[PDB]
Design a binder for these strands. Structure first.
Length: 41
DNA sequence: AGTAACCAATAAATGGTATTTAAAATGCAAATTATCAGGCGTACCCTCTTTGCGAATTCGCGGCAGCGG
């Protein structure tokens, strides 16, 4: 479908649109996993 | 109201060759103050959205393209 949109801004927004937000639970989940990795090392 | 240029003489006529004198002044490189230029950090919560709107009704020409026997 790509209409050869050479505009880099369009490519950036198209790439970033895929990943979806998640709040109040993930942040805690990922922070815990980061601290766990650091504690392991 | 007194002739000399006679021959010695006198040092003054210069402008030229230098190791000095130390005082100055003139530069020189430190110490020692001001001020400028970087780095870091900030805990309520905030989540694609802004754009260009059109190097702006050109036009004529060419040719490298996709569809098609």
């Amino acid at each position: 479908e790509i209409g050869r949109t050479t505009d880099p801004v369009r490519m950036y927004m198209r790439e970033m649109g895929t990943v979806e937000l998640l709040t109040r639970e993930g942040e805690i989940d990922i922070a815990k996993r980061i601290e766990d990795g650091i504690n392991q090392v």
